[PDB]
Amino acid sequence: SASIRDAGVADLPGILAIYNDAVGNTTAIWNETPVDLANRQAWFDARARQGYPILVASDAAGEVLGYASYGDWRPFEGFRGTVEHSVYVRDDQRGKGLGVQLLQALIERARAQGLHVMVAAIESGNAASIGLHRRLGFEISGQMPQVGQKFGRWLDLTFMQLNLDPTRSAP
Amino acid sequence: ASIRDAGVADLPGILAIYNDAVGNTTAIWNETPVDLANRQAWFDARARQGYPILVASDAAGEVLGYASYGDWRPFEGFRGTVEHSVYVRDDQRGKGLGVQLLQALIERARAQGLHVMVAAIESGNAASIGLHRRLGFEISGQMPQVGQKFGRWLDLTFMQLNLDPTRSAP
């Protein structure tokens, strides 16, 4: 069982581990270079400055079982109503619905912040991640062949999105 | 018009085109004009990365249009992919300068050993979508209301061209 809450500085070591595990063992991050704590501390502060949340799923021991966050999608003012999010569940916490918990909480935050669209960039072969998003209302909006690479092979990218306030006809 | 690499002397002309697009089109999703310094820094950033900036020019050396490309997404895994842009001065539209510029860019990207060129086009811009389609680009995404300008929501269409289809692995 896990509770969803805002991340604090003491959560960074845990977040760092999950981040680096994904970097080394998955196609969730299209980087093969692990980062250090200072890197995550800078990221932590940068998110706060933009008013973007960093959420963690923590257990009784206070261990970080997963985390989620979102930030700018494209670097132009025209996209200020759109954010790209990410969800990472610890390798030993799969099948426990933590991904759903985190994304649902993240969606509520994004909507409350007055954002218009959330975009997910998912390695196309990741059926589980795509399925989780589909179940939460996200629709496929991009399918790009060989735009990336990792582990010495080309990777395809799938874009999915959720309109947080479809009844708002204009910004 | 002839295509050539941009020089510092071309920045004022590029600036005018850029700011015209900022205030009049959906080609640039920003509503604030930039200054010469801004485009000089952009010019230098490109040169630093080895990325080209081409201009369509006449004998008088006037900038009739320009094109360039840079990183698409900020992760090493996308190093084989670049996002490009093509801008034709308003009065020079309908003269094939866009085709000239994009063709030149494509050849440059291929010669640089790049793998994929990505175009992010405002969905209602059929002219731009057609230009790309006729040069081998394929639609790869339709993202509604992900942008905004002129007080309205804008849709983004993604298109892409694989520069080396036979290269099965990086």
Side-chain angles (χ1 to χ4, degrees), chain B residues 40-53 68-76 78-83 108-109 112-114:
Chain B
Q40 177 62 68
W42 164 76
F43 179 91
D44 295 324
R46 284 283 186 276
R48 204 163 60 235
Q49 288 188 289
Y51 293 158
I53 296 177
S68 184
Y69 55 72
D71 300 322
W72 175 45
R73 284 169 64 82
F75 308 95
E76 19 174 294
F78 295 94
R79 58 184 179 295
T81 305
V82 297
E83 182 180 336
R108 225 53 104 62
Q112 190 164 184
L114 292 169

Side-chain angles (χ1 to χ4, degrees), chain A residues 3-117:
Chain A
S3 181
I4 301 304
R5 64 178 173 68
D6 282 277
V9 173
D11 293 308
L12 295 179
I15 284 177
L16 174 61
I18 296 173
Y19 182 89
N20 285 334
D21 280 350
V23 165
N25 309 148
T26 78
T27 58
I29 301 178
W30 291 15
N31 276 1
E32 295 175 301
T33 176
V35 300
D36 62 5
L37 191 61
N39 174 290
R40 293 295 84 185
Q41 176 68 58
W43 161 81
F44 178 82
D45 295 322
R47 278 285 187 279
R49 258 178 276 116
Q50 283 183 280
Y52 294 157
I54 296 177
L55 308 174
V56 296
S58 189
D59 59 16
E63 285 195 55
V64 176
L65 304 187
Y67 78 94
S69 184
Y70 57 68
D72 298 333
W73 175 44
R74 284 170 66 82
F76 312 94
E77 58 187 63
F79 300 92
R80 58 183 181 285
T82 302
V83 293
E84 185 183 328
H85 68 91
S86 301
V87 177
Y88 305 89
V89 176
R90 207 167 74 188
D91 70 273
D92 70 320
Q93 299 298 309
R94 299 167 295 187
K96 299 180 117 56
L98 297 184
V100 179
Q101 277 190 262
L102 288 162
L103 189 50
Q104 279 173 161
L106 202 65
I107 292 175
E108 285 170 334
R109 291 301 186 85
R111 188 173 287 112
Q113 183 169 180
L115 289 166
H116 195 55
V117 181

Side-chain angles (χ1 to χ4, degrees), chain B:
Chain B
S2 61
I3 306 299
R4 56 185 182 68
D5 282 277
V8 172
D10 299 310
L11 289 179
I14 285 175
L15 181 60
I17 293 173
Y18 181 93
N19 284 332
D20 199 334
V22 166
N24 283 291
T25 77
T26 58
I28 298 176
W29 292 10
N30 280 320
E31 292 171 291
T32 304
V34 300
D35 57 12
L36 189 63
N38 179 288
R39 295 301 82 184
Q40 177 62 68
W42 164 76
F43 179 91
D44 295 324
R46 284 283 186 276
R48 204 163 60 235
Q49 288 188 289
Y51 293 158
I53 296 177
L54 312 176
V55 296
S57 181
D58 50 31
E62 208 184 338
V63 176
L64 308 177
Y66 76 96
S68 184
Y69 55 72
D71 300 322
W72 175 45
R73 284 169 64 82
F75 308 95
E76 19 174 294
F78 295 94
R79 58 184 179 295
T81 305
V82 297
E83 182 180 336
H84 67 91
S85 62
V86 179
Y87 311 87
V88 175
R89 199 172 66 188
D90 197 60
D91 59 285
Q92 299 294 305
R93 292 173 60 87
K95 302 175 68 178
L97 298 194
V99 177
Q100 277 185 264
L101 284 164
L102 186 49
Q103 294 192 312
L105 256 201
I106 290 171
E107 290 183 35
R108 225 53 104 62
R110 189 172 281 138
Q112 190 164 184
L114 292 169
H115 194 56
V116 180
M117 286 181 83
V118 174
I121 306 167
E122 186 263 304
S123 300
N125 196 334
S128 187
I129 294 173
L131 166 64
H132 292 260
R133 169 178 64 248
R134 292 188 287 276
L135 281 179
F137 285 76
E138 289 167 22
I139 292 178
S140 52
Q142 298 287 192
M143 310 186 75
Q145 302 172 53
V146 291
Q148 58 176 283
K149 193 174 185 180
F150 304 128
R152 70 176 193 277
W153 293 122
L154 297 178
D155 297 341
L156 198 56
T157 292
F158 277 85
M159 300 186 77
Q160 73 178 71
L161 173 63
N162 184 316
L163 301 166
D164 201 356
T166 67
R167 189 185 164 195
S168 299

